[model samples]
Target: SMTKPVGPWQDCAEARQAGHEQSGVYELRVGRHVVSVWCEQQLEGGGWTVIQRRQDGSVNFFTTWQHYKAGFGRPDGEYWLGLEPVYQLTSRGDHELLVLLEDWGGRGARAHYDGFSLEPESDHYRLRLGQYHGDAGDSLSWHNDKPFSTVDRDRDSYSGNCALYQRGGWWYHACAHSNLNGVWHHGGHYRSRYQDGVYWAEFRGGAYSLRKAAMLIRPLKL
Candidate 1:
């Protein structure tokens, strides 16, 4: 039997434009490979591709470069939609970044950026961001235009190799005021002395680990 994929859309943008606007896993063709991505149709008018999502500590954010490149976990679960694929996705057009964070108290906040993109693997998938607009303060500005740092790559701004310190990979600036991928400590409060927790400064500071977090992106037509 011969059959063509009903989708294989370039990204969620096309899928949404195709009138299949629903928050669920859909076929996304990225860089010669077809991957299933969680299309978030509930936030900001839908049409968002979830880049990273975390909840209940079901998966490990602490990993190596190769792992980060290929991605980990499931689309329907806590996972990171790989750096390389994201680079491929962003290359198609300009994009906006949205981050949703929550605390143990159930208080949630949002951070939205006007511009969002990423460099190729050769550049270590450097993150790019534009103007900020959201309820959460601009805590990620410190990490703008920085290369992704993994447990082994050591490409962050600070020399401390913050990836190893926090047991997570991120664009750490002097070990980050916002460590979104750090160790998960339930109830937000954990041990003292070490600034290693899923923190989002300007909202909860480094002492508290977030109860939930999500990073999503969508093409911006300008």
Candidate 2:
């Protein structure tokens, strides 16, 4: 206890180092802002800080650009931890991304990126990804280097706006291959006539929607 992380932590990883290892919500004093986060402290080595999560369809994913940038939902439930905090944390150090997914039938899978980061708002909070490794397939690579898009902001390269068609904010590359932020469907099918539902095309096909998902990030170092 002599040498341990203390108050005003940077992220969940640091909080875990301070013995805040329980997986739940926490308030991390990142930069000048106090940001709330959901800690996935038991997964893998247990330093996972959740950035985005979707389950139960309790919160609406479809919204404007500002909302996505500012984030939505609860850290204890479905949440998007905002682009600002994500960018700030990643810019501070090398981090990894973990995309955990589940199907309605209870099958689970993951998509991991050894390196991941985001540009500041000046870059429209653009996405940067590293090599992919997982069973969910490399569905996100298509959106690599793409700016975050929304109904109010047309950042995606789609001729019109993938976020508009998909009804959610994401790095939509011509609106293809993936859209985890899309509308949450109950039966996991029959809602994407316009590619407008939570889906990982390569793993479950564009026609089927996933049941649960969470995007977690943590620094490479312990």
Candidate 3:
């Protein structure tokens, strides 16, 4: 689970609302990731925005002003908060970006998208969703450290309802099944297919049928 940053700070929207009048770096907590190398701005045309440089060297720019102002998460009835935060802190000129090279509680695990960690062994991987407490929506149920493999229809492989699978040099998350042999949802239906070691599943007539995000354990992938 993620923890909110304790700041020697200012709320990003509060700064804009207060007419801080300057573009500057701010501490940002976006979903499960936190960054001190973030900045927000009040655009000349009348909107607020935030941006951050990611660990992979890519930039994430959030332009949804209303959602940001409302604080991140399901607030405002949209999920954009996962990519943005309502609260941000401007650097006090004595602040430094927080750079954590190793993940907390992940001594032998490799992190995946959306706070999931994988402990890779010689021929398989054990997966666990990280613990989170505040704001980016409620934390997911603790997965029982499920194991995955390259084999198809393996009934004893995974214990969790969602997981990532690799096939034909491509990897995809299967978010709608409890096991490999179960009826899976794929692209909006009770569809299940196994092709070249890759399995795809989807629920038929379920809310997630058309909403891929609903079935995805982690919407973003690294």
Candidate 1 error regions (>4 Å)? 1-6
Give the TM-score comparing model 2 with the true structure, all chains together: 0.93
Candidate 2 residue pairs in clash (backbone atoms < 3 Å): none
**Segments of candidate 3 deviating more than 4 angstroms:** 1-115, 132-142, 152-207, 214-222
Q: Which number leads on lDDT?
A: 1
**Which stretches of candidate 2 lie above 4 Å from their native place?**
1-6
Encode model 3's per-residue lDDT on 1-222: one tens digit a residue: 354433323434434444455555445454445543222333322113232111221111122223223333222122223212312222121111111111112221111123443343332334444443322222123223544332332323336322223221111133323121222233323333422111222211112222212111211212
Which of the predicted structures, 2 or 3, would earn the higher TM-score when compared with the native? 2
Sorting all predicted structures by lDDT, with the top scorer first, yields: 1, 2, 3
lDDT of each: 0.85, 0.84, 0.27
Estimate the TM-score of every prediction: 0.93, 0.93, 0.25
TM accuracy, model 3 = 0.25
